[PDB]
């Protein structure tokens, strides 16, 4: 029948990365970031335990936005109350803490799993560049 | 703007006769001249604030960690400590008279814990209305009637979060603003405040500067009795 298809035995090793968002578009970078963090790009992806990796984003405020969706695309957040719809533009998020928008964009492609909660906790979206994570000696790579 | 406040204990309710024969209700609060426990600057702490320590007690009468910190900080053991946001114009470890902060006719706001009604009905908590009781009105007499929130899979078939129903009323910290300052007593550092103010007579009440009327002062004088022999 089979060679008894194998996986890992909770032998996961994860590395830290440094990426700066200054000229890359939202979606086409977010898809690859999600692929990296979920373990999609790995050769021996083991969904049973994990095959993902960590993520740090530096200077998300300088990320580029495309076309008219800056002033045209609007995102809604609903609190469970009457009139809880908060409908804000992409440029509105630029005038605000924009890293959460990228966080939500990445989460939107996350499959409905009991591990996506821990796949997304390894993503640290920062508007700044200086933080305590720089002392962990990340495996520096970017532009995925 | 920068918020200036002072803490005190209410001791009773009375009234006074202001100028031009106006009977003004008086809340009497002995304000304690406090000594700030710390100041959080806008640069080192990234936001303006000042933690005040008030209701002074004995070191033996205070629990070990905080009284030891007070002694190491060369401060006095006090019953309560509270931070006031947006206040760095003062220094750390001072004895301050609030007379220089609030004036005779300044408008302030008061944060106080209201008298606890506990678990009360929405008839009083949310002030519902009830009409005639004659001609047959069913069992209840203090009720709300309809709680229509969706029947059948069409409209809601649920109950709304954040609804206004019966529950905990009173025993909660609320702020009332834009009330006049009436009376000062520098002999014992006590204040007489116009209107009606929450807070039990004996509890802790904070009186801070109103941010709707920061520098709105008015001429206020007290009508001493004209009947003098």
Curated annotation (Swiss-Prot), chain A:
Keywords for the protein's UniProt record, in alphabetical order: Ribonucleoprotein, Ribosomal protein
Do you know which InterPro entries this protein is assigned to? Answer: Ribosomal_uL13 (IPR005822), Ribosomal_uL13_bac-type (IPR005823), Ribosomal_uL13_CS (IPR023563), Ribosomal_uL13_sf (IPR036899)
Q: Ribosomal protein: is it a keyword of this entry?
A: yes
Q: Which PROSITE patterns match?
A: RIBOSOMAL_L13
At the top level, the lineage of the source is Bacteria
GO CC annotations on file: cytosolic large ribosomal subunit
Q: Which residues cross the membrane?
A: none
What's one GO MF term for it? mRNA binding
Q: Name one Pfam family in it.
A: Ribosomal_L13
Free-text function comment from the UniProt entry: This protein is one of the early assembly proteins of the 50S ribosomal subunit, although it is not seen to bind rRNA by itself. It is important during the early stages of 50S assembly.
**Subunit note:** Part of the 50S ribosomal subunit.
Q: Which family does the similarity line name? A: Belongs to the universal ribosomal protein uL13 family.
HAMAP family recorded: Ribosomal_uL13
| UniProt name for this protein | Large ribosomal subunit protein uL13
Which source organism does the UniProt entry give?
A: Mycoplasma pneumoniae (strain ATCC 29342 / M129 / Subtype 1) (Mycoplasmoides pneumoniae)
UniProtKB/Swiss-Prot annotation, chain B:
Q: Name one GO biological process term.
A: translation
At the top level, the lineage of the source is Bacteria
| The keyword Membrane belongs to this UniProt entry's keyword annotation | no
Q: Which GO terms describe its molecular function?
A: rRNA binding; structural constituent of ribosome
Q: How does it assemble?
A: Part of the 50S ribosomal subunit. Forms a cluster with proteins L14 and L19.
The entry assigns this protein to a family as follows: Belongs to the universal ribosomal protein uL3 family.
Q: What is the role of this chain?
A: One of the primary rRNA binding proteins, it binds directly near the 3'-end of the 23S rRNA, where it nucleates assembly of the 50S subunit.
Kindly provide the name given to this protein in its UniProt entry.
Large ribosomal subunit protein uL3
Q: Which organism is it from?
A: Mycoplasma pneumoniae (strain ATCC 29342 / M129 / Subtype 1) (Mycoplasmoides pneumoniae)
Q: Which residues of the full protein are shown?
A: 1 to 229 of 287
């Amino acid at each position: 029948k089979t060679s008894m298809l194998t996986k890992e035995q909770a032998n996961k090793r994860r590395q830290w990365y440094i990426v700066d968002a200054a000229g890359l578009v939202l979606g086409k970078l977010a898809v690859k970031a999600a692929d990296l963090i979920r373990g999609k790009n790995k050769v021996d992806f083991t969904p049973n335990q994990d095959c993902g990796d960590y993520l740090i984003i530096i200077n998300s405020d300088q990320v580029v936005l495309t076309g008219n969706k800056k002033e045209n695309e609007f995102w809604y957040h609903h609190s469970q109350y009457i009139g809880g719809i908060k409908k804000v533009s992409g440029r509105d998020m630029l005038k605000k803490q924009s890293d959460k928008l990228v966080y939500n964009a990445v989460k939107g492609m996350l499959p409905d799993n009991r591990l996506s909660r821990r796949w997304i906790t390894k993503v640290h979206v920062f508007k700044g560049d200086k933080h305590n994570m720089e002392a962990q000696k990340p495996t520096t790579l970017n532009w995925s | 703007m920068e918020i200036r406040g002072i803490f005190g204990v209410k001791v009773g309710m009375s009234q006074v006769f202001t100028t031009n024969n106006e009977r003004l209700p008086i809340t009497v609060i002995y304000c304690e001249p406090n000594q700030v426990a710390g100041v959080k600057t806008e640069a080192k702490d990234k936001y303006s604030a000042t933690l005040l320590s008030f209701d002074t007690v004995e070191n033996k009468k205070l629990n070990k960690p905080q009284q030891g910190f007070f002694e190491k900080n060369n401060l006095k053991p006090t019953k309560h400590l509270q931070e006031i946001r947006n206040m760095t114009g003062f220094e750390m470890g001072q004895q301050i008279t609030p007379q220089n902060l609030f004036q005779v006719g300044e408008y302030v706001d008061v944060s106080a814990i209201s008298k606890g009604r506990g678990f009360t009905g929405a008839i009083k908590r949310w002030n519902f209305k009830i009409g005639p009781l004659g001609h047959g009105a069913g069992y209840p007499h203090r009720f709300q009637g309809s709680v229509q929130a969706g029947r059948g899979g069409a409209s809601a078939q649920r109950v709304f979060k954040g609804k206004k129903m019966s529950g905990h009323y009173g025993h909660e910290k609320v702020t009332v603003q834009n009330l006049r300052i009436v009376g000062f007593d520098e002999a014992n550092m006590l204040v007489l405040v116009s209107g009606a103010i929450a807070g039990p007579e004996g509890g802790v009440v904070l009186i801070r500067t109103a941010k709707k009327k920061p520098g709105v002062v008015k001429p206020i004088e007290l009508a001493v009795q004209t009947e003098k022999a």
